[PDB]
Symmetry: C3
């Protein structure tokens, strides 16, 4: 029904995502099918490791000021091992939790291949032949502790990844230049949409 | 029929919202159920009072450079008195207006309690202030040059004895001169409560 | 089914849009009916002409630093000739006619015009050239702003920038937005 229209991490998940070390972050990600598009809400809380309490006064150097979170999917839209996200409670919605057994197909939640193809290569190619690197991307900000003063550059990228031997991918890249002092990585919620693959 | 999926202020409301004084603003808010989430559009036009013509040259102090708008809901998703918004024309859609009499239940439009709870030495147990928030900008007169910091907050409020809450907090640092508070439209989504 | 709920340019279009000269850009626009609202994604790639390789070092003037893209619709939500977008591959998902009032921006919410609202008809945001944080472009989406041809409805994408970009193709990041829909 409306349960099988949503593919999520529970709305209040247990640590389920690797940012620096195993299960160091809670990624809340909801994918809902509104017709041909996926409406998505995402937020990220890191609870231990490198990013659990950002301090770029004591750690300048860019590896403490950016990180990414990859979802990698196979042909059937199943979630692959290289993924930042743990697949245990990443499944179709069931009344505020998930379905019993793991899901066998989720292609209709995948970013559309035509709209977001995995390589783009311009030159030798006519103008009428050219494709869009940028189209594959949403560039926005999230705000740490929900504070306007603490922005984090956020690029969501569709089918950017080749890791494992994935067909589909959603990649959240976070980065900042402010030198934050004892700021937990606790993101504001972020709404976005992409064009869906057909079955 | 398909109109039971939408809960709105109507698309063209009469002044229906307190910002500084009684019915001084028109709040346009549409809530639509897309599956497990609420797709929402909001805009705010203030037509009289403190914010009808911002001038922080003549009033520099902070209280003339920020304000909030609270929607407070009970257990059944009915609107409480503490709310900034008047309940008279806030109801399920009917063909570009609203249904005749008020409805008593709208829980499925409420911000999810699990995702956005009211809230601790332990990191791995702790819950997220920020998750409950969307931080963005609206633009006065729809002008890129006139930004307004906008925080939407789910279940932040305790006023009256509300279970659910949507809070629009506006603030600015630019000292605007004779700029009406006329916001650009703002799309957002939140995860919805389920109705047992 | 949900085919008739989507009105798009197709997800990977052939050049289909005038920015400066005929068919000089690929406009990707998806409109989906989620209840009373339209959920939309838009992105623009210009492939030839004035904006195919922006350089405001060599062309500083205003006309090289902004442009708009107009969709003009009649009473039935059919696409009119004055439009920036070519009508040939602008149709319901899986292909052909438009008769598509339910995808139009609501007249009450967004009229042609105590007080009334300039802003309400507008969404003001940024897109990013090449998907690069460093290359912002001021973007205003406007509903029923246009009078060209004899349109009833209109969607207008206005892009503008002040940064002096050097050999930057106009390749926009995707942009999600919603508006209140007209009833049939």
């Amino acid at each position: 029904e409306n349960d099988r229209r949503t593919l999520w991490t529970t709305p209040d998940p247990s640590p389920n995502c690797k940012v620096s070390e195993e299960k160091d972050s809670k990624l809340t990600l909801v994918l809902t099918k509104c017709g041909s598009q996926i409406l998505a809400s995402v937020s990220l809380l890191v609870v231990k490791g490198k990013f659990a309490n950002i301090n770029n006064k004591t750690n300048p150097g860019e590896d403490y000021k950016k990180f990414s979170v990859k979802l990698l999917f196979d042909a059937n839209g199943k979630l692959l091992t290289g993924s930042s996200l743990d697949g245990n409670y990443w499944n179709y919605k069931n009344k505020d939790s998930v379905i019993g057994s793991p899901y066998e197909n989720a292609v209709p939640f995948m970013p559309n291949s035509t709209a977001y193809p995995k390589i783009i290569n311009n030159g030798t190619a006519n103008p009428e032949d050219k494709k869009s690197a940028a189209k594959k991307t949403i560039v926005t900000n999230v705000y740490l502790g929900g504070d306007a003063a603490k922005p984090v550059a956020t690029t969501i990228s569709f089918n950017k990844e080749t890791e494992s031997n994935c067909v589909y991918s959603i990649t959240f890249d976070f980065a900042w230049n402010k030198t934050y002092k004892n700021v937990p990585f606790d993101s504001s919620s972020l709404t976005f949409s992409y064009i869906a693959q057909d079955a």
